[model samples]
Target: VETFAFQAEIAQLMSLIINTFYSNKEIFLRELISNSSDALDKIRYESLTDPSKLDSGKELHINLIPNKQDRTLTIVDTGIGMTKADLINNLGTIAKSGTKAFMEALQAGADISMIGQFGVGFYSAYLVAEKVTVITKHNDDEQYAWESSAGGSFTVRTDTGEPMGRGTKVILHLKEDQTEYLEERRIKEIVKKHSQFIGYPITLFVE
Candidate 1:
């Protein structure tokens, strides 16, 4: 088991992100699915040169599954997956985001306004989940599961289930106060609002 501890400032930033900036909780799914679209774009671009890199046979899409009985909602994507180092670097530190280069490019007259900024978008899951579980399989690495409660530490381990083929699944253990986000209608509305223009298909499951 590999565990990560956030630097004090990063911990404080995550605290501010989850408790303060994420007031509109429904946006959590939007941000996540939007990130999924970006991951699809990444894999698609990679596959252009290395055709074997495309592992997921399905058309790129995002699926939202609500399990009211379990008080959980899962956001699944057939997109790029992360390795353990990716979990530490991508999830652990905000400063390592490609957004920084995007911002620099924008300053240099590259148009990237459509690019989703911030690596911290993953943390938005904390807005609604008491605990979050991320199951992922990278094209070039072993599959792994990462679990976090979003205070200051996280756990990473090898995945035990059948492979995901490729991509990621984020299971949100919904908090008692956030059951509204589990409603299909509510989730659909939220997805359409912030991500209808997103390049990949997004679906919300009911019942």
Candidate 2:
């Protein structure tokens, strides 16, 4: 496993999200679903130019897997998964170019929506999770798992546990205080509130 330190911007963004956005932690689900929707959109758009992109025939959708005993929440999506570089760049570059502007907006008490606009919505995972693991497979690259404890760094390694097929899975090891996320009723309510119209079906693996 190759580990890398978080960029300055990512650390700051994480701190802000956890400290400032604590009360609105449910939005983490929305942000993740929105990201999955974006990935599905990208794969669909790319397949237009290269029909082979969608030859796998994987239907586009999202799945929510909550484990009450394990105290984890997993979100899986059949979408354009990220390569190693994509994960590094996408997560490492959180608000890299607009830190000052984003900080200023937060200081001005802008709404929680500001987090999504700046693309650091992923870090919001730290609000409720002690650790986050992203296992993803892309057509152009081998499957990989990226893990972070919302600390100073993160690790990326080639995934060997199972055949991931195609797309990504985000597993959140919920903080003890945040176990509420493992409740199916709460998750369904949050989905109904924030992602009812995300186009693709969002299903909960209920077993």
Candidate 3:
């Protein structure tokens, strides 16, 4: 039950994404899925050289479920999850993209079709979601959930529900003008358009 508004830092970042990426609102899915892929790549790369950190026999995939009853869309992944410290450092701070360091550590012979170099691609979720919820679990820490209305600040707390074991889930609470995103037909089209070339399977659950 703790939160503070870094309004100046977040407002500008929100404004940037809302302005830059809004027109292509559907692309927000691409950015999120791209991020999930990057996370998967991280664990995969590590597994090769340092096998202990990686999970055992888990399939790598992405799940996109849109619930009309709840007026929400959820995107989950089977990638490296984030810890509490990661929640604070990554989602809490602005303009501090961990992607740069990730790119620097990328080994040769490992080609990841990563389009989200800026790291701020996650912010694009603001374009369609008036409120966004992120539930994640990392190997080293307990499960946690993050929420932001994209108003001025976000909050993070421990999740008491069933653990995801690994990876992340982003639930987008769509805006009045952005409800088209909840449509299964529309979602499939957007996925094919922006992410068909993506390495992993991008699934859509309309029910």
Candidate 4:
């Protein structure tokens, strides 16, 4: 098992993001989709250096699949996938994110509303999920799976199936109390509110 460590401040920040920062629970999908879009943007920027890096030629898209039978909603994207270290550092720490810088910039007269920042977005998934599983495939490495319950610890391991062409899929195991998030209309409304201008196509599947 691969073990990861986080700074004390990051732990505190995670708690804040998961419990208090996000005002609405329904925005979880929007935040996840927005983060995926940023990942796609990252790969797009890298593709300028290596053209072959572009894999998903389907014009960036986000898919929301809600399984009523299982009470789970999955948000998937064909974007950059994070390595094990990326998962630990990215999800476990907030200092690596520009969130602090963005705030400082805002205080220094920068337009906060115009700034597109996403450091703490992933943890927002906990708002609706009792548990979360992330399946990802990176261009330079093998496929991997990461699971966490929004607690202090998480698990990361190599996946066993055919690699996911290139991207990420976040499956949110919805809690009994938050089952309302499974509705297509509700998901679409949240997407429109928080991710309409996300720069990627967002699709929701309800069944």
On TM-score, the leading prediction is 2
Badly placed stretches (over 4 Å) of model 1 are 56-58, 94-116
Write model 1 residue lDDT over 88-160, tens digit each, in one string.
6755555545445544554676432223464546666777889999999888788899988878888899998
lDDT score of residue 157 within candidate 2:
96
Query: Cα deviation in Å at residue 12, candidate 2?
Result: 1.4
Tens-digit lDDT track for model 4 on 71-167?
8899888887788777766555545455566446646865423233535567667777888889998787878888877556677889886667888
TM-score of each: 0.84, 0.93, 0.82, 0.80
Report every candidate's CA lDDT. 0.75, 0.83, 0.74, 0.73
> lDDT ranking from best to worst?
2, 1, 3, 4
Candidate 3 global lDDT: 0.74
Best by lDDT: 2
Ranking by TM-score: 2, 1, 3, 4
| C-alpha RMSD in Å of predicted model 4 compared with the true structure | 4.1
Poorest lDDT segment (10 consecutive residues) of candidate 1: 110-119
Q: Is candidate 2 or candidate 4 better by lDDT?
A: 2
All-Cα superposition RMSD per candidate: 5.1, 1.7, 6.6, 4.1
